[PDB]
Paper text:
The β‐d‐xylosidase LbXyn43B from Levilactobacillus brevis DSM1269 is a glycoside hydrolase, predicted to be involved in the intracellular degradation of xylooligosaccharides (XOS) into xylose. The crystal structure of the β‐1,4‐xylosidase from Levilactobacillus brevis DSM1269 has been solved at 1.9 Å resolution, revealing a two‐domain enzyme composed of a catalytic domain with a 5‐fold β‐propeller fold, typical in the family GH43, connected to a C‐terminal β‐sandwich domain. The enzyme, featuring a 5‐fold β‐propeller fold typical of GH43, prefers short XOS substrates, notably β‐1,4‐xylobiose and β‐1,4‐xylotriose, aligning with its role in hydrolyzing internalized XOS. The previously shown ability of L. brevis DSM1269 to utilize xylobiose and xylotriose as carbon sources for growth, combined with the current data, leads us to propose that LbXyn43B is the enzyme responsible for the first step in the intracellular metabolism of xylooligosaccharides in L. brevis DSM1269.
To further analyze the structure, the enzyme was crystallized and the phase problem of LbXyn43B was solved by molecular replacement with a resolution of 1.9 Å. Clear electron density was observed from Pro6 to Asp540. LbXyn43B crystallized in a tetrameric form, in accordance with the size estimated by SEC and OMNISEC on the native enzyme (above) and with the oligomeric state reported for most xylosidases from GH43, subfamily 11. The tetrameric structure is formed by a dimer of dimers, as is observed in other β‐xylosidases in GH43 (Brüx et al., 2006). Each dimer is stabilized in an antiparallel way where one dimer's catalytic domains interact with the other's β‐sandwich domains. Two loops from the catalytic domain, Lys92‐Asp100 (LbXyn43B numbering, between β‐strands 6 and 7, blade II) and Thr144‐Gly156 (between β‐strands 10 and 11, blade III), interact with the β‐sandwich domain of the other subunit. The sequence of these loops is conserved between the enzymes in the different strains of L. brevis. Both dimers stabilize the tetramer through loops in the catalytic domain, creating a large cavity between the dimers exposed to the solvent. The most extended loop that connects β‐strands 16 and 17 in blade V (Ser269‐Arg290 in LbXyn43B) contains Thr274, which is non‐conserved in enzymes from the different strains of L. brevis. The active site of LbXyn43B is in the center of the catalytic domain, is solvent accessible to allow substrate access, and is orientated towards the central cavity of the tetrameric oligomer. The catalytic amino acids are very well conserved, allowing unambiguous identification of Glu187 as the proton donor, Asp14 as the catalytic nucleophile/base, and Asp127 as the auxiliary residue.
Numbering used by the authors:
A (entry chain D), B (entry chain A), C (entry chain C): 1 to 540
The structure:
Amino acid sequence: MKIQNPVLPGFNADPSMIRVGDTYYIANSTFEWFPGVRLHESKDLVHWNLLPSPLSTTTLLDMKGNPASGGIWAPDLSYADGKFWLIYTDVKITEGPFKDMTNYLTTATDIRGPWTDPIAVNGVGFDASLFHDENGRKYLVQQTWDHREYHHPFNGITLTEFDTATMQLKPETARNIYNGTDVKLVEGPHLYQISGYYYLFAAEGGTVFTHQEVVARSKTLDELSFESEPDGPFITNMDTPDFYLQKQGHGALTSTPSGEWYYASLVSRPWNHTNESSHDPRGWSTLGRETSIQKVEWDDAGWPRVVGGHGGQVEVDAPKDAIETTAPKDHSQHDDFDQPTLDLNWNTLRQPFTAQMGSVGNGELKLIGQQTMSSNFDVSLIARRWQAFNFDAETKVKFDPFTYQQMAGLANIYNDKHYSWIFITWDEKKGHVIEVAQNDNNNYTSYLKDDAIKIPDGTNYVWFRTKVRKQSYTYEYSFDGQNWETVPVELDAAILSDDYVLQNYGGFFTGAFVGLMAADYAGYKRVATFDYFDYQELPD
Amino acid sequence: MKIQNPVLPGFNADPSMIRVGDTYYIANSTFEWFPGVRLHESKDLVHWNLLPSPLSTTTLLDMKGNPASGGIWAPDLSYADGKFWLIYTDVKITEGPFKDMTNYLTTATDIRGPWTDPIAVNGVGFDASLFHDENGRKYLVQQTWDHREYHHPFNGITLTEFDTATMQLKPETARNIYNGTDVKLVEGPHLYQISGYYYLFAAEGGTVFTHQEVVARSKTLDELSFESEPDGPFITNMDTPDFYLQKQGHGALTSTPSGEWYYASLVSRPWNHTNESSHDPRGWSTLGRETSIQKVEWDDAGWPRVVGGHGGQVEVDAPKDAIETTAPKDHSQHDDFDQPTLDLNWNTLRQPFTAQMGSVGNGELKLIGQQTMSSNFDVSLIARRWQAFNFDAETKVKFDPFTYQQMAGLANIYNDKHYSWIFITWDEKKGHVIEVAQNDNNNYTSYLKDDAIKIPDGTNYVWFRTKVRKQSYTYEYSFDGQNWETVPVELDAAILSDDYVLQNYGGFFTGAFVGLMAADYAGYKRVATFDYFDYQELPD
Amino acid sequence: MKIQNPVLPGFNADPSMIRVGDTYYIANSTFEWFPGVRLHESKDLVHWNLLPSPLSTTTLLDMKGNPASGGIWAPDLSYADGKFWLIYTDVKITEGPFKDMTNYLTTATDIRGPWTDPIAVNGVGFDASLFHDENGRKYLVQQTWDHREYHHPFNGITLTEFDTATMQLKPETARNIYNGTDVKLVEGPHLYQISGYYYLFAAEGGTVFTHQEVVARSKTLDELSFESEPDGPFITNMDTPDFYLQKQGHGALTSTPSGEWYYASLVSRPWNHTNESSHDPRGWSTLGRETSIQKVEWDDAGWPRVVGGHGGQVEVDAPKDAIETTAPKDHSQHDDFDQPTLDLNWNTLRQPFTAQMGSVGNGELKLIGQQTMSSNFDVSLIARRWQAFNFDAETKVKFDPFTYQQMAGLANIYNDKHYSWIFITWDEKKGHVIEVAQNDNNNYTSYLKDDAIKIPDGTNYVWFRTKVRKQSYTYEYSFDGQNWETVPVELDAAILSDDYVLQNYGGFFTGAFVGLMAADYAGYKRVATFDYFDYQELPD
């Protein structure tokens, strides 16, 4: 009976939410993480189950070499004409005057797939959304990039009509339907036909603490015909600096079977170090942009308003007609690698898990060492989101390196310039050793150096653990699985947060992950064998 | 009779030079420019002709998404066992603690191809070189990357033996043969068997003004057996700060049929702005790393020495047995696009010229607008090196944009963050206009803005010209090909120089190019038609 | 018999060297260190004694608030008309388009003083030098600052004539006598009348590794009449990157009684960390700019040349008529504070040692805690130069702090943003403790924090020691003077080097010092008592 926000914890950004009959679906952005577009299902809005990602082949999504926080930006899921339509955007540039992107369309009769070979739709801007008019016409509504430095870069909301026989746009039909408000950065447009009006929802202010969603309406789809909601915005936490939820905005409106109204929003829970002002910095989002759900009611003038005020609520009444959905009690994961395919919570960087990266099955994960976590190409790594502030993760691994260019173990990663791990490697004095390293915006630290821990001569497998405790984390190791030693360094979790990455890079749209990887930049394909992976969430 | 250095002007870096009978060949690094590996041929060392590049397919070279100054680093061309062997390196990371690279091998019975499908050899380090021992054994000798921040990053010269039946390395044979001198950054290793000794040539000091080449020798290929040449180095311009040639070092030794000896080196001719100290900065290399050739003699103790002293000479005596080679008088280019394939002097960024980029033939180049010059993906651009300090380039282009996201014209480019051009685009008030823009490390300037030049309603084609004058350059346009207007903006050529890019980016290994491109980041594939391209070199 | 360079080790920059009869004098720049202008005397050029500094009162020198590496730049000492003339410069701005300076004149009949109340001469530029023409006319010759960013900042060598009755300049006589060479940054001018010519010595290239001295001559003092020495420069180590001496240039020529010729130059001995290329960075000068002396001979065309070539020599033949001079064997210092005035080797920051800073005598130094080493105002600190690569320094101090804002101990300091120390302070949990801190360009580290060492309840005095070992240094403490504990942190000496400070600040002209200080930024004037100071130089 009670939605507890965030409902989708950890990296679950840019929710597109729809209802088909009694079933709700949310699609989230995935950026450089493969497979592309995360899908979840529910019948109550409270409990959610992970579905297979649509963009699961290189025919659907080719992101080798993509910059971090390029790839899949906000997706748009829709249902019309007896099928699912997915608009998705592959962004190739994350900084500077340009943001070159391609918007694609795929479809499916079943939410689990298979998905049709993608059609390229256009560029123009990101946050592309398929509007299905009740009269059978279809349109793309999107953000509009402007590279001209003497203008504002978000040049209104473009609406362009499809030829529905080919699903190619007719570019001559393009127009700006809405310029937004003085907060600018107008994006994330969605159109809805409600009570004889077209309602436009749009995100503004950028996806940090000044984020908001605004609402406009028009009787038509004419150029600059949309009028802004009075007493706006619809949702923001800009002016609620102490609230548990922050950065709400970009999202999607859905009805229930009974005619209630809900809004899924991206959201963050940024925390502070003990010595910081709570209001500067407002905090660090290690769990990145998650998804919340807010209830909506309509005021007497026909404008939608968030229940509990424009900041939303932590706890929200579930739909009256909610059908109870069974879901795991938390996001803990206990993987024996018993199955021939990866658990759905695992993701790879940019590319599918192929035989080149390794194999899973019969109780073992094998990763073939290729490029380091610093590469945008051919990284043999699997990882899953941080979905709690406190957790323990553990593995048991065997690796036989003969050079220092071979490394394998347990990692925490944000991107190619923000990661850490504890790993087995080789050194000239001791042979097989354990080291811990952190890459902090290419300031790279090896903690143990010459004092790397010697792996005793009888030792086959090494056990590794990371203990994440909100603001900080540690690595531990064991030669028997029972007696553990802590490596005496406390790592700052803020290094793996959106708010930290934003300081020196314009792509900061994911969240921290934990996982397993092997590297061999000697190019000799050294194999690491992992017997299990455990991720155990702890109370907050 | 007289070699005039640089013999290969403009971007012609990292020369690997061999002799087969009476013919000399030089292979140069190409980085992100496609096709990969530049080849030149001569029988006199004075005059050189361009041959087809070996790495001309995505089976041989796949660099989509590569960072600028990644891709093809120093290549190694060798002839043994009646065929050509090419070792080449695709570098995927240009900054930070790692430099993930793969070394590949292809072979050919004819220097013009075809080349065999590549074998992956290893990583370990760049500057990989195939040593063919007279006894039939074969080895890879290379630089050795060390990511450990508490060590020096260039960890000696690794030698590893091949299994010659499969041409796969036997990693257990790896050893460090040479640690270099205190100047460090030891790389560019080549081994030669001469007069009963193995001679090792290696580059040191990095490829900027502290570059040098050193020589070592051993009776064996044993671990750390190589002894440094006394009274070194072999070549450097570090300590000749006023000399016309700079940055000499990384290169290759060849004999002539009569037993003379020559050394090809990379080289630069960096210039100064008027107000700068000649010694700080030492200058700006718009023509990048070019190739020089120096004569070598052997001293009484059996050590090789450059004729004219360790700084080399501008003019060098050609081989006594030189066979005259005819070559074009300069590198001017007059292209009517009359042929169905591109002139060899044209390159693309990262990827082959496919139908997706456009077409050439019957007097026209068609470029299909795709991503901007800011992208590492799908850029419809062809360009050729700056090969003189002073030149005029000109084209005639037709383009019908309906949005400001469509741009086409005449460009000067170093990389995705360092380029300029004059182009046709569209604006809201005037329609078809001419603009000039410069991207200076993502500081992007539109020069004309609202004062972009209106293209008159009669106008089919627009003519564009760039005049490069060493330190600075301008753009001009014409609506009839006879009456020209100069855009009143003088651009700094130093923005397209290795030495400028080095200030904020660790990949700075190419050189300035001039060419033609079309962009359509609206994604509507707008086509630009170019009737010709002219590149006219002028005296220094 | 043998000058061993550097003859004046540690910070002894910008030597002005003259001879009066059989006695040589060198004056050196002192920047923010008080008293101003360092003076040394010798009769052999091999052994040197420190004399009292001229600028010993606030009437002569007022530097409170001066930026680090402002204050006293290159001085000029001359002897004519039976007295010493000192031109000195107080620089108030060290970065940006301006470098506002005032040049002053003081005189003395005795080198040890007293010195006359200073006359303000002009601004115009630094490196002002008094030229006494044989014909009785007198001139100021100087560098010429140009703030205009579209010009080169060093606008030739200005010569302006004095009215010798008032020793005020006649501005109308100003002209540029010499523009220098393409190396630019022309400064440090000195004029000499020799063999019917005016010879001009000038420094160029800036005071780092591209430093050089050039020589020009003219029959007149006419505008742009000076012609450059062929086959220059006169002195440089730019092109001797492995030589023990570096950065030679700015200096002064003197004759001996017998007609021999010597040149005193500033010089450095920059060292490398073990992992660095010897040529980039060329190294770290913890001992700053020291003084060397080179021998000069005249070629057949009447041009001066350094004996041993333009790089100079480490060891140089002393004058034939040299009179062996008694001097301390090294710069060790054993100070019991038995005297009522400070040993001459001690300096203060910016201001005289007044009763406000404390007192000395009867076996004790008392420092009254005022502002921290981070301040340009009222710092109770005395310090002496690092003058060897390896040394031990030690003190015994009593201090009774009641707040953490009170700190006193043994410091190593370069400037307000580059220092370290071990000190007594107070903390909330333990009371009197020992801490170590480093300020590294305002990245401030407290090493022990909560684990600061508790000072036992009976302890009156604490003993402190620093052991400097070229590239690195440590701190030790003792509660009895016999049993020592090392604080387990190795500090990088490069943080207190010119070459490090230059990376982020345009004033980098001094050198590392070691000394004693007390701070009380609670403003309660807490007094630290030091019983002795020992500085013991060790072999290289």
